[PDB]
A paper describes a structure:
Clathrin-Mediated Endocytosis (CME) enables cells to dynamically regulate the composition of the plasma membrane and mediate uptake of transmembrane cargo, such as ligand-bound receptors. This process is orchestrated by the clathrin Adaptor Protein two complex (AP2), which interacts with much of the endocytic machinery and functions during the earliest stages of CME. NECAP is a coat-associated protein that binds to the alpha appendage and beta linker regions of AP2 to facilitate endocytic accessory protein recruitment to sites of endocytosis. NECAP is a ~ 29 kDa, soluble protein composed of three domains: an N-terminal Pleckstrin Homology with ear-like function (NECAPPHear), a central Extended region of conservation (NECAPEx), and a C-terminal domain with low conservation (NECAPTail). Here, we determined cryo-EM structures of NECAP-AP2 complexes which show that NECAP clamps AP2 complexes into the closed, inactive conformation.
Numbering used by the authors:
A (entry chain M): 1 to 21, 26 to 140, 155 to 222, 240 to 254, 261 to 374, 379 to 435
B (entry chain N): 7 to 23, 29 to 97, 101 to 138
C (entry chain B): 5 to 190, 195 to 269, 275 to 549, 554 to 581
D (entry chain S): 1 to 141
E (entry chain A): 10 to 239, 244 to 512, 517 to 606
């Protein structure tokens, strides 16, 4: 039955937990909330334990269980838990729950008793619950003109992203944020009305989770009217659950002060139907370098003496593969501080995890449909300061 | 009989008359409640019903979405003018969010997308 | 140590308020403790002072101590046993909320020492006159069992729970059947004249949750004859229209089991409307509703044969029900309604969801292979999708038309000219593996096939091995059809597959093709260029298991319950 | 150098947050959130040496309070680990068995103690005596 | 000031967050009405109003006023009002050029003062704000405060660190001059507290000016000689001045070994005495003594590694780090492993570190924490040369069978490199890789299988052993997916060296044939025809697979093209063509 209710916030911090017979707490945190590449089924069996969850306004309502529970009943209970909690709070939020930690403890011993859901009718609970809750015209579109009549209706929606990463050489992701934007060449005729939808990867020096819009955007579903042609729709930054496209392994073995053995292994952390292009890896050398023997079997690499960095230009790299480069650097004799091994690439997905789910287009007067509109997407991911500490 | 879309929070404004939005009252609705869009085959009905009991207030056959039975206001993308049958009469709907007036327009588009489409397979 | 001090700070301000005599400040002091537990503060020094607030008569005060005792009933059980001597005082007072509060709290304490303190106040609560107390005394028996108590005394308690099934208030029979179902994993005397007739008279009266546990118990019932199985199904079928996602699938779980039977054709017209209106609910309920339709339309296809229009995909659906309404749309695609599916699958291929368009285009291919009089429509959809010139559609339609050329040989060859105009837009390793086959086979007809494979050969490396094997097979098929003009390619690729390549799976295909063509090209036509056979669901042993588990989570994964 | 000193509760409400870099008002708020996303997780069997964002966190668990001193990578992390505990004992004998609420009701006197020991990103004073001979001279002034 | 405690008790005892902001903005409406209303606030009543503004700012709220009213407090004649004034304007850093002149008018009124509790408070306001507008006016007057001997010694600690902040913000604004030869002279001072801020100053300033402060080496070493070879004011649990003898020992790292041989005679015997106390019994069993004695040590080790001067110490510091690997505290294992990674690289200790190979492996297997564990793997890869390569690689594999899911990615990459770099002969290298694909073959690259097979194809006496090794590895019911490719090839090409019987090998591979990917199922179909050529009696049992409709009628094109052809080779009446077309393949280039 219901092994317990785990009300999680946006960050993955446990607001309210109940257990009815924890590794189940952070197995939901790592593998459902901070899930990187997985398509989100609402119920998932992760290591012999089932994880039901229902999101209501940036709140993860996990109902973690073990046995063979009636899965229709759990999901119908996780709604009935909200419709009680909506009658006491109004909107479910991180701010209303933290004001009402006491009330939710009286609900979760009244609406369920040892996992079994009970008589959760809100007219009946008011005799059994003593705690009370703590509550809290567009005249002319000035960014497109009248009578745009194109011969063919199109949307070229390309999501442009830049990836910034500083990774410790132990594989610990120290700093990771993606500063990306959504650009759409809009060749729609008439005066259309889009409803851009997307998944929940966007929150609506140090990088801050942020998202700004165009002036046409109106605000879970972005609804607008597109200006004529190209316009930067949505600019954002996000620092959580970044799909890192490449892992760089800096295996550096210094031998005294007369040699330097540098081995760098790239591992590609994306699926092999995708394919990354224009890979460049800059492996920095000491300042007193007198001559370098690069032996890499895949791609081209050469010692750039004016830059003091081994630039390893490999043209294309598919997903899930890996490459090596060896460089027995000779030195000419202070210890050498190690600047990071920077990497430059382009990937045909969005490494922030942003995926476009739907984009309808309605025009009221001179009618055409969504299925009349040839709609492109083109996810372009790119490195920025993509460093790995040597 | 299917249900195309059903939404609460619509507002009925009386019509002094075109059909510009600001020429109405716009301050207090003459009715409020839940919107239901039903489909009896080829004839689409809009159903203005109360949000508590289900009392049907007003109802309008459409049969032509670019036709005069549903006419969007030239000013804004959310306020509408509907031809209620009782007897032909003009009351004015007006919706809260744009997504509640986009999903109204799509639901009366996709039903008449289907009615024309079955007229194509009838010829085949 | 530091920062504990036992004399000031947050604790001594609370121990001054917990020992305040007026109960107006007591209630506001315990509320600050409970909010201090969730953040993680050490309030274990407050424990013998909160329990002094139980000596009271105010109802709002005892529920606040019990929440302080509930969180310590499960996290640190050896502390909650310090308060057990005031629990059994509260199993005897009036205002029988408190009767149900003490029995609920003692059930959560996982210490073996409560059993001589709980076994007697359960027996007064199972015969209490206010049936809110029996609603949680019946679930405490299932809480006493999970405590390590084999307990033949609790086998004296199961004598009371079977009496609780024939009670008067059906919120008691909601838990008494729910406890006797879960304690039956260690029973449930399904007497045909008395128990089943009393379970079903409970069923029309219970809560919307007790009508789940009764139907999850009748899924473990076996009829005596087929005359009984009709008179049970005539009382479950009124539970196919209730306002809960859960009750209906549990009433499908009984009906799909009790079709061991005229009425067998009558019941399938009654099982189809609620299984269709099971999809007007919220998005997570549909994902359970669709993956139980996905068993029913495999097990008994004649139920939802005529209702494919409801399973169409809306734009605003989440992706776990866009990929699942797509799958059930394939299994219901037949000769009559392939005109409505292919005109609908063309509509999903002009969307923007990349991993949904990539499956909506493949669903055209699973309609051409499934419905054999409709491949002209499935090809005419795919040759129109490539006219949209969308590079994630053309790179997927070129893989599907490969699977239509294989299923249906030498009928649809004429569109290869329409395909290969978009040769430059091929980038994916699966899409390029499909084009090299389409030039490889039918190279007797494509005149410049000797140049099309050579343009792939300059970048032979830095490709996937799926392409490198296929290009090795295609040039050899080009050799054995034209052994006069493309011989200069066969020295090339077969000294690229063997002399250069390091993959031995590519290398051993090279030398096997190399030793065929240097030995006997007459035999080599019989080996490489032989007429290939045509190409083409839960396995019914596993399927008949899952229909016993329709509503449950075993069906949602399509996995048997021994993998949980 | 020391880049910030951070006394924070287990709940996350900060008590001392002394900054030694130029961070914006929101950048100060996010770094605080990232510290107790790290320090609240790991227990006493782990090291006190978190490799935080670009530079180390040195923390100690004190009975519900975490004293996080955030340090460059090339500094002696075991020396600043006792600079935490040298700082706690100064708050001990100055607040006379310091409790948690003495950092709240006397927040301006904590800023004197941290400017007495940790000035400009660096350990100014090491002595517990010469602080409390100086710091108790300020109190009668 | 008891007006503050009434306020904070009202804020913390709010019922909600919204009840705070209703009370916060009620108090800000009170504070704004007192200041802008301008009824004369009699000193200390303004002090509690600014302090309420400072508490409201520390709760996260916004304060946009009261900066002018705190600059009133800087000209006060009491320390208590200057404390809140010099705290409100250093926490709420503003950009108003109206106010920065009014602040710097007030700081110069306190630096002109001779009071060390006002000069000691003004240098805190400069070194916390640290802006260029304060740096331009004070770059020349803070050094003359720091140098002139009439300054109280509790102000020289603050000015030396205020010049440290003024140098790190605006380095092109404090120039080296006649100020340099007195800061070096501060290392002979009577305090050990002035020396703590002096070696803080000389450490940063010699990063860019190394030669101007070369006279501090003979003063740091003679000052460290009296600390180590001894301070009742500065002992920290019986350790004499830990943070001084850390900062005084990090000043020495900014330099070469000292030019004067009387100082190397003094620096090395003072590095011997720090290294000698680490083996002595502990004067206290407290854990805050076991860090402060080892905090001086891990700079004394980090000094010796930085010099690389004398081999006697690098041997002893390495033998010192041997004890900290078997230590009950998690810090001293994690800091020993970071030190030995920098110690194993230099040429004087590289022989001495290899004697601790048995201790790190026991520290590899025992440790729960993965962050200390990954430092052990980085040490083993740094310790490895040819004289101990087979010792580590065999013990990294025997670790890898029970390893956690975290570190398993890192080891497989390092075992495959250490096997290829340090291959004694090819018979060993096939033996470990075969095991690496057996133990953790999911993380073994497809670049790594190829050198396994190309050594088995090229050489002769690793053909029988690698035929045994993959057959014993495939009999596990849950072997990894990549060995099914490696074993499915090697048993195909070299199956007649272990014939256990042919009917076992086909039934083993065909049991592995399903539940696998496309190229695994592809490569096994190339195996099933190699058995027909080598093993004439298994032929009837293979074609019953190759005629099934799970092979010939398969959906993906490569399995169909491979299963149809490898059906026709053994079915078309031909034995001399099959033995020809599937002859033993030539070796690789």
């Amino acid at each position: 039955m219901i092994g317990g209710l785990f009300i999680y916030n946006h960050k993955g911090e446990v607001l309210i937990s109940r257990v009815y017979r924890r590794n189940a707490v952070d197995a939901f945190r790592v593998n459902v909330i901070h899930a990187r590449q997985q398509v989100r089924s609402p119920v998932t069996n992760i290591a012999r334990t089932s994880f039901f969850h229902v999101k209501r306004s940036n709140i993860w309502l996990a109902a973690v269980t073990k046995q063979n529970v009636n899965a229709a009943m759990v999901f119908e209970f996780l709604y009935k838990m909200c419709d009680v909690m909506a009658a006491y709070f109004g909107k479910i939020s991180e701010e209303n729950i933290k004001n009402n930690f006491v009330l939710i403890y009286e609900l979760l011993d009244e609406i369920l008793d040892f996992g079994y859901p009970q008589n959760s009718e809100t007219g009946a609970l008011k005799t059994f619950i003593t705690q009370q809750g703590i509550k809290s015209v567009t005249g002319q579109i000035g960014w497109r003109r009248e009578g745009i009549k194109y011969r063919r209706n199109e949307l070229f929606l390309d999501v442009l992203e830049s990836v910034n990463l500083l990774m410790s050489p132990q594989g610990q992701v120290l700093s990771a944020h993606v500063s990306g934007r959504v650009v759409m060449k809009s060749y729609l005729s008439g005066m259309p009305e889009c409803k851009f939808g997307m998944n929940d990867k966007i929150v609506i020096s140090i990088a801050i989770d942020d998202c700004t819009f165009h002036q046409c955007v109106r605000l879970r579903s972005i609804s607008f009217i597109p200006p004529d042609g190209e316009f930067e729709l949505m600019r954002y930054r996000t620092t959580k659950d970044i799909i890192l496209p490449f892992r760089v392994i800096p295996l550096v073995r210094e031998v005294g002060r007369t040699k330097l053995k540098v081995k760098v292994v790239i591992k590609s952390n994306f699926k092999p139907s995708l394919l990354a292009q224009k890979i460049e890896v800059r492996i920095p050398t000491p300042l007193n370098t007198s001559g370098v023997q690069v032996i890499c079997m895949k791609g081209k690499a050469k010692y750039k003496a004016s830059e003091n960095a081994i630039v390893w230009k490999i043209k294309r790299m598919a997903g899930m593969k890996e490459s090596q480069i060896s460089a027995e650097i000779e030195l000419l004799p202070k210890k050498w501080a190690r600047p990071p091994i920077s990497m430059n690439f382009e990937v045909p997905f969005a490494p922030s995890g942003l995926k476009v789910r739907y984009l309808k287009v309605f025009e009221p007067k001179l009618n055409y449909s969504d299925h009349d509109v040839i709609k492109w997407v083109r996810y372009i991911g790119r490195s920025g300061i993509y460093e790995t500490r040597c | 009989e299917s249900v195309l879309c059903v939404k609460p929070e619509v507002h009925v404004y009386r019509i002094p008359p075109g059909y510009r939005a600001s020429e109405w009252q716009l301050d207090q609705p003459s009715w409020s409640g839940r919107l239901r869009i039903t489909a009896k085959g080829k004839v689409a009905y809009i159903k203005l019903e109360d949000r508590t009991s289900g009392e049907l207030f007003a109802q309008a056959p459409v049969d032509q979405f670019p036709g005069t039975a549903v006419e969007s206001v030239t000013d804004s993308s959310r306020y509408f003018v509907i031809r209620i049958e009782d007897r032909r009469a003009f009351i004015g709907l007006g919706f809260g969010d744009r997504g509640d007036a986009f999903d109204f327009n799509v639901a009366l588009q996709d039903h008449f997308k289907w009615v024309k489409q079955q007229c194509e397979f009838a010829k085949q | 140590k530091y920062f504990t001090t036992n004399k000031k700070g947050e604790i001594f301000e609370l121990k001054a308020e917990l020992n305040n005599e007026k109960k107006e400040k007591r209630k506001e002091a315990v509320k600050k403790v409970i909010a201090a537990m969730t953040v993680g503060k050490d309030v274990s020094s407050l424990f013998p002072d909160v329990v002094n607030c139980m000596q009271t008569d105010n109802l709002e005060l005892k529920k606040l101590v019990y929440l302080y005792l509930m969180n310590y009933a499960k996290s640190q059980p050896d502390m909650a046993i310090m308060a057990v001597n005031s629990f059994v005082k509260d199993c005897e007072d009036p205002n029988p909320l408190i009767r149900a509060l003490a029995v609920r709290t003692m059930g959560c304490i996982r210490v073996d020492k409560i059993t001589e303190y709980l076994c007697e106040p359960l027996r007064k609560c199972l015969k209490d006159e206010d049936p809110y107390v029996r609603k949680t005394a019946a679930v405490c028996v299932a809480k006493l069992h999970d405590i390590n108590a084999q307990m033949v005394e609790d086998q004296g308690f199961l004598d009371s729970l079977r009496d609780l099934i024939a009670d008067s208030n059906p919120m008691v029979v909601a838990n008494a059947v729910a406890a006797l179902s879960e304690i039956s994993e260690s029973n449930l005397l399904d007497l045909n004249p008395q128990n089943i007739n009393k379970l079903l008279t409970a069923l029309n009266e219970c809560t919307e949750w007790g009508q789940i546990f009764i139907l999850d118990c009748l899924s473990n019932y076996n009829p005596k004859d087929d005359r009984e199985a009709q008179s049970i199904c005539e009382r479950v079928t009124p539970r196919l229209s209730h306002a809960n996602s859960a009750v209906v699938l549990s009433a499908v779980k009984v009906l799909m089991k009790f079709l061991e039977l005229d009425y067998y054709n009558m019941l399938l017209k009654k099982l189809a409307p609620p299984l269709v209106t099971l999809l007007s609910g919220e998005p997570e309920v549909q994902y359970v509703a669709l993956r139980n339709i996905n068993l029913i339309v495999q097990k008994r296809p004649e139920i939802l044969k005529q209702e494919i229009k409801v399973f169409f995909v809306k734009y605003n659906d989440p992706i776990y029900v866009k990929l699942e309404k797509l799958d059930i749309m394939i299994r219901l695609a037949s000769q009559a309604n392939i005109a409505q599916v292919l005109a609908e699958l063309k509509e999903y291929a002009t969307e923007v969801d990349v991993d949904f368009v990539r499956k909506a285009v493949r669903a055209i291919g699973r309609c051409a292979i499934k419905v054999e009089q409709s491949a002209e429509r499935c090809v005419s959809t795919l040759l129109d999708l490539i006219q949209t010139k969308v590079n994630y559609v053309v790179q997927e339609a070129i893989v599907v038309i490969r699977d239509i050329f294989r299923k249906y040989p030498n009928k649809y060859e004429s569109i290869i000219a329409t395909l290969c105009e978009n040769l430059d837009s091929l980038d994916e390793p699966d899409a390029r593996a499909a084009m090299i086959w389409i030039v490889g086979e039918y190279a007797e007809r494509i005149d410049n096939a000797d140049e099309l494979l050579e343009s792939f050969l300059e970048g032979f490396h830095d490709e996937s091995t799926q392409v490198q094997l296929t290009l090795l097979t295609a040039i050899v098929k080009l050799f054995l059809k034209k052994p006069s003009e493309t011989q200069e390619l066969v020295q090339q690729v077969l000294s690229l597959a063997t002399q250069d390549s390091d993959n031995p799976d590519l290398r051993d295909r090279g030398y096997i093709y190399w030793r065929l063509l240097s030995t006997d090209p007459v035999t080599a036509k019989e080996v490489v260029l032989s007429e290939k056979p045509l190409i083409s669901l839960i396995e019914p042993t596993l399927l008949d298991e899952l229909i016993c588990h329709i509503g449950s989570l075993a069906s949602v994964y399509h996995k048997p319950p021994n993998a949980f | 150098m020391i880049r910030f000193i951070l006394i924070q509760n287990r709940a996350g409400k900060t008590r001392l947050a002394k900054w030694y870099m130029q961070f914006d008002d929101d950048e100060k708020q996010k770094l605080i959130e990232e510290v107790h996303a790290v320090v609240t997780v790991r227990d006493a069997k782990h090291t006190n040496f978190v490799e935080f964002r670009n530079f180390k966190i040195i923390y100690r668990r004190y009975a519900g309070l975490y004293f996080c001193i955030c340090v460059d990578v090339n500094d002696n992390n075991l020396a600043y680990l006792e600079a935490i505990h040298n700082f706690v004992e100064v708050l001990n004998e100055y607040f006379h068995n310091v409790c948690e609420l003495d950092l709240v009701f006397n927040f301006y006197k904590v800023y004197t103690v941290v400017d007495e020991m940790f000035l400009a990103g660096e350990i100014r004073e090491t002595s517990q005596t010469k602080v409390l001979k100086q710091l108790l001279m300020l109190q009668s002034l | 000031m008891r007006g503050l405690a009434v306020f904070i008790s009202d804020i913390r005892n709010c019922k909600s967050k919204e009840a705070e902001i209703k009370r916060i903005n009620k108090e800000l409406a009170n504070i704004r009405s007192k200041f802008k209303g301008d009824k004369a606030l009699d000193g200390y009543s303004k002090k509690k109003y600014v302090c309420k503004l400072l508490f409201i700012f520390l709760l996260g709220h916004d304060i946009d006023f009261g900066h002018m009213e705190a600059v009133n407090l800087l000209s006060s004649n009491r320390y208590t009002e200057k404390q809140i004034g010099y705290l409100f304007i250093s926490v709420l850093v503003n950009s108003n050029s109206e106010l920065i002149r009014l602040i710097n008018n007030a700081i110069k009124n306190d630096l002109a003062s001779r009071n060390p509790t006002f000069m000691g408070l003004a240098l805190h306001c400069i070194a916390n704000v640290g802006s260029r507008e304060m740096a331009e006016a004070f770059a020349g007057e803070i050094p003359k405060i720091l140098v002139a001997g009439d300054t109280m010694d509790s102000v020289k600690q603050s000015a030396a660190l205020c010049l440290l902040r003024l140098y790190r913000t605006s380095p092109d604004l404090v120039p080296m001059g006649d100020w340099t030869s007195r800061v070096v002279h501060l290392l002979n001072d009577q305090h050990l507290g002035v020396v703590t801020a002096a070696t803080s100053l000389i450490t940063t300033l010699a990063q860019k000016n190394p030669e101007e402060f070369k006279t501090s080496v003979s003063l740091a070493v003679s000052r460290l000689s009296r600390i180590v070879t001894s301070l009742q004011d500065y002992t920290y649990y019986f350790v004499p001045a830990p943070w001084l003898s850390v900062k005084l020992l990090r000043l020495l790292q900014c330099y070469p070994p000292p030019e004067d041989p009387a100082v190397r005679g003094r620096l090395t015997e003072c590095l011997e005495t720090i290294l000698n106390k680490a083996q002595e019994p502990p004067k206290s069993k407290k854990v805050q003594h076991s860090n402060a004695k080892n905090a001086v040590l891990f700079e004394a080790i980090s000094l010796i590694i930085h010099h690389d001067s004398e081999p006697n110490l690098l041997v002893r510091a390495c033998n010192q780090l041997g004890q900290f690997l078997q230590h009950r505290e998690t810090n001293l294992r994690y800091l020993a492993l970071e030190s030995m990674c920098t110690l194993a690289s230099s040429e004087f200790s590289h022989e001495a570190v290899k004697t601790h190979i048995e201790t790190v492996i026991n520290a590899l297997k025992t440790e729960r924490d993965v962050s200390v564990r990954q430092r052990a793997v980085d040490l083993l890869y740094a310790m490895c040369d040819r004289s101990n390569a087979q010792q580590i690689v065999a013990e990294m594999l025997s670790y890898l069978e029970t390893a956690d899911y975290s570190i398993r990615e890192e080891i497989v990459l390092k075992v495959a490199i250490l096997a290829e770099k340090y291959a004694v002969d090819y018979t060993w290298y096939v033996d470990t890789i075969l095991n690496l694909i057996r133990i953790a073959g999911d993380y073994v690259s497809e670049e790594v299988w190829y050198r396994v097979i190309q050594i088995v194809i090229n050489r002769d006496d690793v053909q029988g052993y690698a035929a045994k090794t993959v057959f014993e590895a495939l009999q596990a019911p849950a072997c990894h997916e990549n060995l099914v490719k490696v074993g499915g090839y090697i048993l195909g090409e070299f199956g007649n060296l272990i014939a256990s019987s042919p009917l076992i090998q086909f039934n083993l591979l065909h049991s592995k044939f399903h539940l696998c990917s496309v190229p695994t199922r592809a490569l096994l179909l190339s195996t099933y025809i190699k058995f027909v050529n080598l093993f004439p009696e298994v032929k009837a049992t293979i074609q019953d697979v190759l005629r099934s409709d799970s092979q010939l009628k398969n959906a993906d094109v490569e399995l169909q093209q491979r299963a149809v052809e490898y059906l026709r080779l053994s079915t078309v009446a031909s034995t001399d063509i099959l033995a020809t077309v599937l002859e033993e393949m030539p070796p690789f280039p």
